[PDB]
Amino acid sequence: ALKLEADRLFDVKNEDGDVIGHALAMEGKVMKPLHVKGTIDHPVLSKLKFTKSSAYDMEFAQLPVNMRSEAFTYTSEHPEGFYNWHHGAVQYSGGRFTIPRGVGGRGDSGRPIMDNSGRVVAIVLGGADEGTRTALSVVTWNSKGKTIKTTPEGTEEW
């Protein structure tokens, strides 16, 4: 098994170039957290017209007809249990996505949370530490395609 995958996740860098977040190709759009102020490290995508959505901390542009195939697929069905992401397992329980305390932070915004079949279940924006864990502030859509934004008490944007 070699992890040969398309180009879907892109870096968003700051003025000096630090990676402060992530942008993703999904369901025909390039999307990144609105609070993430930087540029998308991509010669084509950094030149697109991004539409803003303050209510959900989302910014998005339409994917170039070409790239539209190199993208993630969303899913609105998330039974409880364990999910995958860049740093490991993500536990979904009580309608909340949690990761161990001291794992998430700056740079992790824009990152997706996947299921085993490789579908996106959510997009990380920030987290609120609660005891031994951290409750994530994510964006998720429902079965009727409606965007929903869950933000725990005292969530710090990553």
Give a topology summary.
Elements: E1 9-13, E2 19-26, E3 29-33, E4 39-40, E5 51-53, E6 58-62, E7 81-85, E8 88-93, E9 96-100, E10 112-114, E11 120-130, E12 133-141, E13 147-150, E14 156-157
Antiparallel strand pairs: 1-2, 1-4, 2-3, 3-6, 5-6, 7-8, 8-9, 9-12, 10-11, 11-12, 11-14, 12-13
Describe the structure.
The structure is a monomer. By secondary structure, the chain is an all-beta fold. It has two domains: 8-72, Thrombin, subunit H (Beta Barrel); 73-158, Thrombin, subunit H. The chain has no helices and 14 strands. Strands 7, 8, 9, 10, 11, 12, 13 and 14 form an eight-stranded antiparallel sheet that branches. It has a six-stranded antiparallel sheet with strand order 4-1-2-3-6-5, with no helix packed on it. A hairpin with a 5-residue loop joins strand 10 and strand 11 (120-130). The chain starts with 8 loop residues before the first strand and ends with a strand.
**What's the end-to-end separation, in Å?**
32 Å
Number of domain modules: 2
Beta-strand residue fraction: over 45%
CATH class of the largest domain: Mainly Beta
Structure summary, number of beta strands: 14
Number of helices: 0
Q: Topology as H/E string?
A: EEEEEEEEEEEEEE
| CATH homologous superfamily assignment of the largest domain | Trypsin-like serine proteases
Task: Summarize the biggest pleated sheet.
Answer: 8 strands, antiparallel
Quaternary structure type: monomer
Structural class: mainly beta
Shape: globular
Specify the CATH architecture of the largest domain. Answer: Beta Barrel
Q: Bin the helical content.
A: under 10%
CATH topology of the largest domain: Thrombin, subunit H
